[PDB]
Amino acid sequence: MEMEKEFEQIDKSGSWAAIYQDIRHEASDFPCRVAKLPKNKNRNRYRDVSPFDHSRIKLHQEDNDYINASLIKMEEAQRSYILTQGPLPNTCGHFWEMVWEQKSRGVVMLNRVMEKGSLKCAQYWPQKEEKEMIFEDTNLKLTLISEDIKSYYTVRQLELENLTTQETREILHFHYTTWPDFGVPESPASFLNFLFKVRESGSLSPEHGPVVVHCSAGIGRSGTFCLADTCLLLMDKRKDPSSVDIKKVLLEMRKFRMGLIQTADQLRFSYLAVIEGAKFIM
Ligand SMILES: CCc1oc2cc(S(=O)(=O)Nc3ccc(S(=O)(=O)Nc4nccs4)cc3)ccc2c1C(=O)c1cc(Br)c(O)c(Br)c1
Hints:
Elements: H1 2-13, H2 16-26, H3 33-36, E1 56-58, E2 66-74, E3 79-84, H4 92-101, E4 106-109, E5 114-115, E6 118-119, E7 133-135, E8 140-149, E9 153-162, E10 167-176, H5 189-200, E11 211-214, H6 220-237, H7 246-253, H8 264-281
Parallel strand pairs: 3-11, 4-10, 4-11
Antiparallel strand pairs: 1-2, 2-3, 5-6, 7-8, 8-9, 9-10
Helix pairs in contact: 2-8, 6-7, 6-8
The structure holds ligand FRJ.
EC number: 3.1.3.48
Keywords: Acetylation, Endoplasmic reticulum, Hydrolase, Membrane, Oxidation, Phosphoprotein, Protein phosphatase, S-nitrosylation
Membrane topology: Peripheral membrane protein
C-alpha cells in the first residue's frame, strides 16, 4: 500500500514535523473580514481560529448572520462538511439555527465538555429527557429523545423544533468521548469505528445537509475526521486507489477552513487512520 510505505519512510527518517511544517507553509490564506468585525468578538472562541469569508456559513437572520463555521465542499468525494467551533454560552442558539437552516442530520462532537479541567464548550444539548432546552434568541426547542452510551462514544437522538413553524426534525448527536487530553489515540480503531457509525446513520449522505463537526476550535480533531473520511471515500471511487494523496486532500480542505490538523502528531494519526481504514476494507 503506497501511502503506508510513505508513512513508514517518514517514521524511519523522523520527519513528521518537517512534513507538517511544509503543509503549514503551503496552506491557503484567505481574508476573515466578517469574523474580525468588532461586533462579532463575542462570537469567536479563539483569536487565531476564524472562518474565511468565502466559505463561512451565514445565518438566515437579518443583521448579524455571523457564526464561526465553514463549509468544506469536497467536489471529487461528493461530500460536504461544516466545521465549527464548540458553541459558546452566547452562541448555542446560533449553533442550532445553523443546524436547522443547513438541513443537517448529524452533529459530530469530538471533545468532552470539560477537558484538562477547563470548559471546552457550552452544554448545548439537553442531558435529560424531561428537561428540554429552549433557545429564545433563535426560537428553537431541543429535546433529548434517547441516549446510547458506548465504550468510545455516545449516540443521542434529539428533536429540534422550529417554534415559529412548529416543524420538527430528528438530529443525531455523535459524541466521541475518548480522545485523550494529550496527543492522539494509540490506535485508530475506535475513531474509525466511530466514523463509520456516523456514516451508517446517513448523517454524511447527500440526501441531507452537511454534517456539523466540532471540537474546541473545530480544526484539529475535526480535521482528522473529515480528512480520513474523504481519503477513504476517494480510494473507493478511483480506478487507482494509490493515487489518493492525503497531503493534497488536506491542502484542498485548507482552502475552506484554516488550521485543519494542528500538530505533526495529528497528521501522523490521520495517515494511520486512512491506512488502517483501507486495510479493513480491505
Ligand atoms: C474502515 C472501517 C474500520 O477500520 C478499522 C480499523 C481497525 S484497526 O485500527 O484495528 N486496523 C485493522 C484491523 C483489522 C484489519 S483486518 O483486515 O485484518 N480484519 C478485517 N478487515 C475487514 C473485516 S475484519 C485491518 C486493519 C478497527 C476497526 C475498524 C473499522 C470499523 O470500525 C468499521 C468498519 C466498517 Br466497514 C463498518 O461498517 C463499521 Br460500522 C465499523
